[PDB]
Design a protein around this ligand. Sequence first.
Ligand code: SPH
Lengths: 245, 245, 245, 282, 40
Amino acid sequence: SDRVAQLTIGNSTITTQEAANIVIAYGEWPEYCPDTDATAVDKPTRPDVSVNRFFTLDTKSWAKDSKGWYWKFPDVLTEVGVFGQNAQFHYLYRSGFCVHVQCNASKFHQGALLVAVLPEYVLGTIAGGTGNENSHPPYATTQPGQVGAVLTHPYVLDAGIPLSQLTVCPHQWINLRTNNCATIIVPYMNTVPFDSALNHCNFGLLVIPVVPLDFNAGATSEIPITVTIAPMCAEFAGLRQAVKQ
Amino acid sequence: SDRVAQLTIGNSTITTQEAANIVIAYGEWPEYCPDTDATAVDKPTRPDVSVNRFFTLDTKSWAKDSKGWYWKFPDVLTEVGVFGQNAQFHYLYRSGFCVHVQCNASKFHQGALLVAVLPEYVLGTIAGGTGNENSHPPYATTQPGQVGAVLTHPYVLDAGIPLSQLTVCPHQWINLRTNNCATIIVPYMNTVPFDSALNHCNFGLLVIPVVPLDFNAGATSEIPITVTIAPMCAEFAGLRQAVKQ
Amino acid sequence: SDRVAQLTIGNSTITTQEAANIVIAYGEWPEYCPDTDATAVDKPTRPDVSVNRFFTLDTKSWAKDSKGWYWKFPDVLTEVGVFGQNAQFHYLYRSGFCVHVQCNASKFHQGALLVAVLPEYVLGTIAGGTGNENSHPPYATTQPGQVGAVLTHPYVLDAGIPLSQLTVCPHQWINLRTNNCATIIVPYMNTVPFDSALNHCNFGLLVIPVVPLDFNAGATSEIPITVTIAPMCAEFAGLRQAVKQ
Amino acid sequence: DPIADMIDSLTALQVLPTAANTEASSHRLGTGVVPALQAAETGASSNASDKNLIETRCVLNHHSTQETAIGNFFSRAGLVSIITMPNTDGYVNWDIDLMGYAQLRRKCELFTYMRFDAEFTFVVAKPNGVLVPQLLQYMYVPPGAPKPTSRDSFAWQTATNPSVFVKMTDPPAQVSVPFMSPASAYQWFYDGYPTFGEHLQANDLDYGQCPNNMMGTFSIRTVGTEKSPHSITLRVYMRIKHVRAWIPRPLRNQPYLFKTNPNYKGNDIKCTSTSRDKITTL
Amino acid sequence: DPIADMIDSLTALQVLPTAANTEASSHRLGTGVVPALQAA
Ligand SMILES: CCCCCCCCCCCCC/C=C/[C@H](O)[C@H](N)CO
């Protein structure tokens, strides 16, 4: 009876009846910055309900030949709600996250998704194909917003590193015969206690179908994937006029 | 594991493996009449096994356009068994009831029934349609026996009162994806401690499909509904020759 | 949660998730022979890992008109592994068994197998049909090896005794809607503490479909039955050159 | 000790002289407690009682369980042999096999193993039942002992063999016989072959023959040197005493054909039940 | 006595003069405890 779960934070609640555990990334819960680690001297703001709540992004469609999707954090929320306004009016930000990915299907469907969190997900290019061009990814690719982007070569994760050892990162699976959701709680990971929300992305969320989706003709062919996220201990400092990017 | 239940009373047993709780109507168990509430001076008879046992009535057929059914209590049992003979030879009767409604279907069927107990279910007519006739329901309508009758206008319960607030009465649902039975235990409710079994009906049992039955072609289309009832603390007084009605 | 089970002995493990209990035949676990019951004076050998391990035999195919199968013990293992070599080099043997029969099917299949252990399963013939021939079963019939044989008249178990009271023996059922395996632990049963492994069979394992297999066209029609067995307290005495039969 | 891995029943009996009492019970309504729903796939019998299915009264019953004990079930003399001296030279050598009469054979074959003492009774008369003054001698010949070849053989000196001298006008003779198997019990079913070697089709008679049950030869004669003018008919009856039994079996539903094998007539398989026309009409 | 079988509410009231108070609460993340899922 641990297959049922309820996540309540702010004015939002997620219920699930077909779940695995909750993964706490590297065994650490999100926290506020203590006085020994802080360096900036001004008092930070902690809104504590209007920013620490569940945010639901756009919905993907799992087809039979999907490659995979990725999102960048906290780039997905810089234009959404009161979190997106505090991130534009302040210079520094610090927070953890609770990521929840939903995908339900019937008992006659099959497939498996790998849902992983990779910190400092730096993207590469195909270098013009032949390897001679020093190409760089565009701004819509490195920071795709709340919509997200599609992976072009998911076997090398578009960065030259294999998918087969992506499970060294905090991860869960969505196996369609077993569960319909995955939940990872991520703390703040950086070399600095605060950072910019418009210039730096802490981690990337990767959702890749390792086993492809399959069903017989006559069943439902529209299988969607929804991502719902929540900041946990959001702090903001360095107040100045609003800067969008 | 409270989805399984067993009701044993008399020489009868009901087993179910897909159940909700048992509803005890108004939080009260059936009882015999105490000396402070009694008024009649003769000693009553309590047969205690031959009348306190489960009785199974006729079986309905849930179609895709069924309106609903009702039964009247204890009119359903006045011709059945030793209970029907004690109710004809005596002038006064008093008892509670345990109602059990059964309806099973497969995991590919859908539909929901509302099973409710309404005390003093007085029926009305359509008043000739235009409202000018002072019409009255016939004797086969107000006391239909163990067969029961069909509701003509279930939205107003054939009495001018809406179905939407019938759940203020003691009730259960039979949702086909969740359970296949409903059980209500009803005490004796009257303004008098004893009453006649042939002239007065204490309550009515209503079984109405709120969500209609639906399935695909090829599945079983014969979905029946069975009602099984048991008197609980049946008392009888005022012995005289047998009167049928 | 007793439907899951794990049997580990030797270097072998069987896992099941849809199981009944384990039957211990006549309430007795297998044991080594004590000094009060023994008669032979030489020291016996107990290999304890190389012989006490799970052995998987050949696989049958349950069709819609199958009669049933039987195996003879320990004749099934006299040519298999280190157990089959200790049984050929020694004159006396003694051991118990753990029998496990596997048969899985979907939730849209139906059928029931009776899996029973019958000690001293002596086979008869049809006596030429008319009853006048004193016929005897051949050597491939009485000791069929690890392959096993098919029952010709399963209603009389090929011995003149009815199937309907075979459940007086230690037994389980494999009902396809309920479980997919059956497990019986058998002790050593004989009138002597040790016996020959090539001349004498202690018990027979019978797998008979009482309710026949049924499914609709389009489902999987290849439903196999696998038998996996393990000696428990195997002892061997009377060492001499290897004798195969 | 340098090597650490070299350091290293369910039920019991009870005396029940009477059958079980019934307790009084009332009604029961609730969830979670369902004593009527069972699972026959586990191999266990149902444990539901009277008091959990219906409302019962209190019954103190004193019905004894003494008659169904296996000592009382088996201590009855049944026919095991009929020996005739019309065999025209005044002696019979009979090989002891007590599986020739169906009534005692079906009772004993309810179990697999049995260990008992016996009591043999010898009822002798003429073929029409008349009795004459005539002296007879019964001799038990164990396996290995010389069996008699004529009426005046040397083996009738019975210097070590047990022998009974009796007259036909006497009461029937009774002797007690111990348990004399080389094993710990008699087995009515032996799944295997007695000897080693190849098992060809010409030696298929060896299947099922246990030498632990072969007890020898029973010999009868008329005592005198000259030929007797009387025909003899001897009936042997056996009581089973001090009995222990193991491993119950299905009882046989087919008629017996031979004394040593479970062979059955395959053209007429008898159904165990009596048939009817419809499943709804009795 | 020779014959042994002849030997043989849920809720209560409370005074509530005012409506119920609300307690302060924080966030909650975990498995097994789901107060929002019901059974009508
Ligand atoms: C003067 C005394 C003569 C009486 C001698 C009787 C000794 C024989 C007793 C044998 C006891 C039963 C042994 C087994 C009998 C059955 O034939 C075998 N089971 C054959 O299957």
